[PDB]
Design a protein around this ligand. Structure first.
Ligand SMILES: C=C1C[C@@]2(O)[C@]3(C)CCC(=O)C(C)(C)C3=C(O)C(=O)[C@]2(C)[C@H]2C(=O)O[C@@H](C)C(=O)[C@]12C
Ligand SMILES: O=C(O)CNC(=O)C(=O)O
Ligand SMILES: O=C(O)CNC(=O)C(=O)O
Ligand SMILES: [Fe+2]
Ligand SMILES: [Fe+2]
Lengths: 258, 277
């Protein structure tokens, strides 16, 4: 167990092996700097002086970020074998004000009640992709992980604060956070904001944190068929090819003429 | 255990008690006959199957293309969505079965259960089999889903009335299905309903009569599970006429987990706020 910084061209099989062994990693140059700027600009345009879904606020988020090949290559190998389809769970902007204290160390899957039935050898209930807007430093509250704690049994006490390993990222790097990885944001002891944005996916049989059916139709039709399924507009296929999120007998996209 | 037939005014505690011991039961007079007949009429009025007259009628113009495929029961039948889904027995049981562990529940799926004459016996199964998380679940854990099978026609042994195996909900997950001789047919009049948790081994019988065995099913499951059916193709006029309870059941409102954490949100607010319900 150890925090690994790997390049963008790392083989997918190496990321999964590091994910199983260490429970987290950082994929550098996950997004290019211009995509990092576009999503912040689009969010700033929407909430120009209340924030809603990131896919509603940012065209780059729903058209570019949610089509990221790394997110889908990882999610396919993590959820595919057991659950079949996956879809978008939630997405937020992670903005730390200067002077913010250390966030409590937690696992993301704690709000799944079925996580208590889960065993550390089972596939994760959700996975998070935390992408850096500003740089992440140990002093501005960058996310801290506890490599290997994803294998701890249910009910294991949170890691001690001294066992937390800060994650250092340039803008565009991504930290991969499976739902079982103990982690928390640090205390921003600097004068500037530490800003990041995240995506999360989970099995299609799980209800997402966010619904996207308040989004206008043109916003939906400009999405790829993959992102449309991610955001809850297409019927999902379980591993047995039994279908959930159906429209009576047929597909939801056929009933809505997507 | 034993298959219990209980009257409508049975206390809620006794019903959940029976569900814990035997894993299933029937509530007599769950619905009145006229209500379940309204659902069928509304379904027939939506599908609009061609009904051949007494003799050939020399049809030329406007032939065919009238029949629609069956959609959600909440879309086809106003009685289903405006009355059946507000049933106090469904919500009393779902509250006590899902509330303490999952918080909110919502609609999972409906079904038109019509057994053809000569239909053979259905494989004996558990309804929660299509939840992969059922392999992690213990028999003492709460159920992953519950089904309410309401009879439209009479349910008999010969017409393939649903069979249950009382107590089989407590078997370990690796347990083989019950033998055919273990199954207990469920005899029901129109309006009765079979209460069917996801862990109860059951199956439709062979319909060895010349008439259809007809009925309707509702199912609910915890709010953190994705329902079989989506209802977001439904017209907005339809959603406005459902109760706030049914709007939450059919996926138009934000759901609350047990720890007051919200899922099915609209960004940071409620879905019903972003849609202006
Ligand atoms: C909005 C959320 C909900 C999320 O904050 C929730 C469930 C929010 C409420 C919580 O009790 C905690 C603090 C336990 C929590 C997490 O700890 C997460 O981690 C989650 C699951 C986030 C996550 O994992 O990914 C980011 C992108 C995100 O938007 C997510 C889905
Ligand atoms: O913002 C961060 O660095 C970490 N945030 C979380 O883990 C969270 O919000 O669940
Ligand atoms: O039709 C019946 O009596 C029982 N049906 C089922 O168990 C089913 O459709 O899953
Ligand atoms: Fe987190
Ligand atoms: Fe069944």
């Amino acid at each position: 167990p150890q925090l690994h910084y790997v390049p963008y061209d790392t083989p997918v099989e190496d990321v999964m092996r590091i994910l199983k062994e260490s429970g987290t990693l950082v994929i550098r140059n996950f997004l290019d700097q211009n995509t990092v700027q576009k999503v912040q600009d689009e969010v700033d345009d929407y909430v120009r002086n209340q924030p809603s879904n990131l896919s509603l606020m940012s065209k780059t988020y729903r058209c570019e970020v949610l089509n990221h090949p790394w997110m889908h290559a990882i999610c396919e190998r993590m959820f595919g074998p057991t659950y079949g389809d996956y879809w978008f769970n939630g997405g937020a902007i992670l903005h730390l004000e200067p002077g913010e204290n250390t966030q409590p160390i937690h696992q993301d899957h704690v709000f799944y009640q079925i996580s208590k039935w889960r065993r550390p050898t089972d596939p994760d209930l959700t996975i998070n992709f935390t992408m850096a807007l500003t740089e992440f430093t140990v002093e501005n509250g960058g996310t801290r992980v506890c490599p290997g704690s994803h294998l701890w049994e249910n009910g294991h006490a949170s890691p001690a604060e001294e066992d937390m390993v800060p994650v250092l990222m340039q803008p565009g790097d991504a930290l991969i956070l499976p739902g079982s990885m103990w982690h928390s944001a640090g205390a921003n002891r600097t004068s500037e904001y530490r800003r990041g944005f995240a995506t999360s996916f989970h099995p299609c049989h799980f209800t997402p944190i966010e619904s996207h059916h308040h989004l206008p139709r043109e916003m939906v039709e400009e999405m790829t068929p993959l992102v449309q399924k991610m955001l809850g507009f297409r019927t999902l296929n379980l591993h047995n090819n039994v279908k959930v999120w159906k429209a009576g007998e047929g597909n939801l996209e056929d009933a809505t003429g997507l």
